[PDB]
């Protein structure tokens, strides 16, 4: 796990998106944030200096995994084409005409199993299954419909609200077929998806994340070795 | 913050002028001038 910060904002998950085959970073801002991701993933997966819908919240506006990526319908055509040139061919890119454009905020997906918004459209779910090639579950995280923001989901670990019950924790972990931990990030910031981005071999947390939280995510994610 | 008549700011404006900034401007004039 690494501590990174976008400008003076510790919610690197909002301003950037991380997957197991590519990295997404904002556009036109501080070059330090892009360099931080490049130093850890430049020689592994391509990093795309892009913006969505003319916004710096691409992390919470876009949802996708190592195979495919989804952007809201409000994404401009020039932004859509720029993503395709930067991203490699084996990474599918698809637009989503959804009532909730915050795909990253409403869907928490790993490479294999995805948890989506309870009110997500059927057509959106079909597109997710087609492009992401993942099993789509329509449930909620800690009683809050924004699964993509209140749950940080990876292949070997997941993080949710600290307020979830033990039985809800165990049910979610069993459904997600992954170990899961109820905790907080960024010294009490309960929005783990906004304050934490993790791939299958590396994790990136906000600069305000406590050492205890950093030790916890490293242990559950088993990325020490 | 100081205004446009700030003596230190006028010093810094000269330092921009005494480099390629005014330069880029000179040959840019020379191009259309030799046209």
């Amino acid at each position: 796990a690494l501590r990174a910060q976008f400008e003076n904002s510790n919610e690197i998950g909002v301003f950037s998106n991380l997957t197991n085959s590519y990295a997404l970073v904002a556009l036109g801002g501080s070059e330090n944030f892009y360099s931080v991701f490049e130093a850890e993933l430049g020689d592994v997966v391509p990093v795309v200096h892009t913006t969505i819908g003319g916004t710096r919240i691409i992390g919470r506006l876009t949802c996708g995994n190592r195979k495919g990526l989804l952007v809201p319908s409000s994404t401009t055509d020039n932004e859509l084409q720029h993503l395709r040139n930067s991203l490699p061919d084996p990474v599918k890119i698809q637009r989503v005409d959804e009532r909730l454009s915050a795909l990253g905020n409403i869907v928490a997906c790993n490479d294999y199993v995805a948890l989506v918004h309870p009110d997500i459209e059927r057509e959106t779910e079909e597109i997710i299954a087609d492009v992401l090639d993942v099993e789509v579950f329509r449930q909620t995280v800690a009683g809050n419909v924004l699964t993509g923001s209140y749950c940080a989901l990876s292949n070997q670990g997941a993080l949710v609200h600290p307020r979830t019950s033990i039985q809800e924790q165990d049910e979610l972990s069993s459904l997600l077929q992954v170990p899961l931990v109820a905790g907080t990030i960024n010294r009490g910031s309960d929005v783990i998806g906004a304050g934490l981005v993790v791939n299958d071999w590396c994790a990136f947390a906000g600069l305000d994340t406590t050492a205890t939280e950093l030790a916890v995510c490293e242990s559950i994610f088993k990325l020490q070795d | 913050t100081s205004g446009p008549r700030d003596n230190n700011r006028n010093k810094w404006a000269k330092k921009h002028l005494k480099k390629g900034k005014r330069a880029k401007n000179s040959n840019f004039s020379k191009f259309l001038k030799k046209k």
């Binding site: 904002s9 916004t55 919240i57 919470r60 915050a102 905020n105 419909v145 924004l146 923001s149 906004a194 | -």
Partner: protein
């Protein structure tokens, strides 16, 4: 606040009652003061999308009411021009209850989220469902 905010048309002056868009239980927000108002003579302070103002919960839970405390406007009735040139206006004047740090007291919001508000406040964008 993160990043500079472009100027946009003001349509939420003081003395305005506006709809409260989160799930914290508040219903009506009453604007009392606006942050970042200069000394303009005989000018009513006004609010726009993404601007933080002192709001009082008119309707909602008795406990969170009686707190003149900052609220971020998320939807504005008055038409405003984005720098791309297009004009936008929302049917309702919607705001979100937020702490001075920049984190929404509620857990979820209802209705579309103005993009200018979303980029300004990362926590709001994190808690946003539909950013239009």
């Amino acid at each position: 606040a993160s990043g500079t905010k472009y100027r946009m048309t003001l349509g939420l002056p003081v003395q305005a009652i506006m709809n409260c868009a989160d799930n914290s239980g508040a219903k009506n927000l009453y604007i009392v003061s606006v942050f970042g108002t200069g000394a303009r003579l005989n000018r009513l302070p006004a609010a726009s999308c993404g601007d933080m103002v002192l709001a009082t919960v008119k309707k909602g839970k008795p406990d969170l009411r009686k707190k003149i405390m900052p609220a971020i406007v998320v939807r504005q009735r008055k038409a405003w021009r984005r720098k791309d040139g297009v004009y936008l206006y929302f049917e309702d004047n919607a705001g979100v209850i937020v702490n001075p740090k920049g984190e929404m007291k509620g857990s979820a919001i209802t209705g579309p989220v103005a993009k200018e508000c979303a980029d300004l406040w990362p926590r709001i964008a994190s808690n946003a469902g539909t950013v239009v």
